[PDB]
Amino acid sequence: LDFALSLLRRNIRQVQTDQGHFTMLGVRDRLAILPRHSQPGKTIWVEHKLINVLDAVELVDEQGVNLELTLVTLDTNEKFRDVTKFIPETITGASDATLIINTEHMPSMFVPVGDVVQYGFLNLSGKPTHRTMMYNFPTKAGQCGGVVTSVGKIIGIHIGGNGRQGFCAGLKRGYFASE
Ligand SMILES: *[C@@H](CC(=O)OCC)[C@H](C[C@@H]1CCNC1=O)NC(=O)[C@@H](CC(=O)[C@@H](NC(=O)c1cc(C)on1)C(C)C)Cc1ccc(F)cc1
Numbered sequence: 001l002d003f004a005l006s007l008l009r010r011n012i013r014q015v016q017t018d019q020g021h022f023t024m025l026g027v028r029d030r031l032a033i034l035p036r037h038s039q040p041g042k043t044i045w046v047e048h049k050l051i052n053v054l055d056a057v058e059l060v061d062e063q064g065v066n067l068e069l070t071l072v073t074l075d076t077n078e079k080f081r082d083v084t085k086f087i088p089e090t091i092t093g094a095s096d097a098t099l100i101i102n103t104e105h106m107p108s109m110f111v112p113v114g115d116v117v118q119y120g121f122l123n124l125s126g127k128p129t130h131r132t133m134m135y136n137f138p139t140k141a142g143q144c145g146g147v148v149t150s151v152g153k154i155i156g157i158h159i160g161g162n163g164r165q166g167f168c169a170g171l172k173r174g175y176f177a178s179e
């Protein structure tokens with residue numbers, strides 16, 4: 001838990017884009033990650049502070065299939081505490097995960113979602129998506145960007161759900177390499 005708490009305080013920010021409220025994980029330096037559908041564009045608000053987005057990269061797999069993740073570089077002089085060490089090299093499930101949500105509307109929220117298991121292909125609102133995992137928990141609107149954590153590991157970012165189940169984009173440490 002001390003891990004989840006530390007991650008919340010130091011790395012997980014309340015964010016708004018023109019698409020609404022999202023949770024945002026800052027990973028290292030000025031690099032953070034949002035769900036693709038948040039469409040960060042040119043600027044975002046972080047805790048109500050307007051920040052330029054210097055680059056927004058929509059991640060896709062070897063075949064160009066959507067991974068539903070957007071890496072953003074933020075025009076700021078502050079650096080995120082480097083949490084790459086806590087991100088697995090290979091997309092991994094987990095047995096007792098906690099979904100960390102942090103928005104203006106759902107501030108500092110820890111959601112026990114239980115087991116996180118490999119799912120794979122997801123037709124998310126008509127958009128082919130790969131490398132997803134699933135949890136049998138009723139996730140809701142406003143929880144996208146939420147950080148899926150397990151015993152000291154950051155394993156996923158919440159991207160969708162169908163009412164009974166939630167789905168995250170799995171994380172690989174390689175996503176966050178310096179070029
Ligand atoms: C988070 C973002 C948000 O709140 O958007 C509000 C306008 C949100 C969380 C979930 C909504 C329901 N419970 C959730 O965990 N994510 C979304 O709304 C995306 C789309 C979906 O989640 C859809 N789910 C499915 O398509 C689906 C399919 C299967 C087998 O299981 N679930 C529903 C809303 C129908 C946002 C999104 C992502 C990617 C896109 F290309 C378009 C839209």
Ligand code: NA
Nearest residue numbers: 040041043044
């Ligand atoms: Na924006």
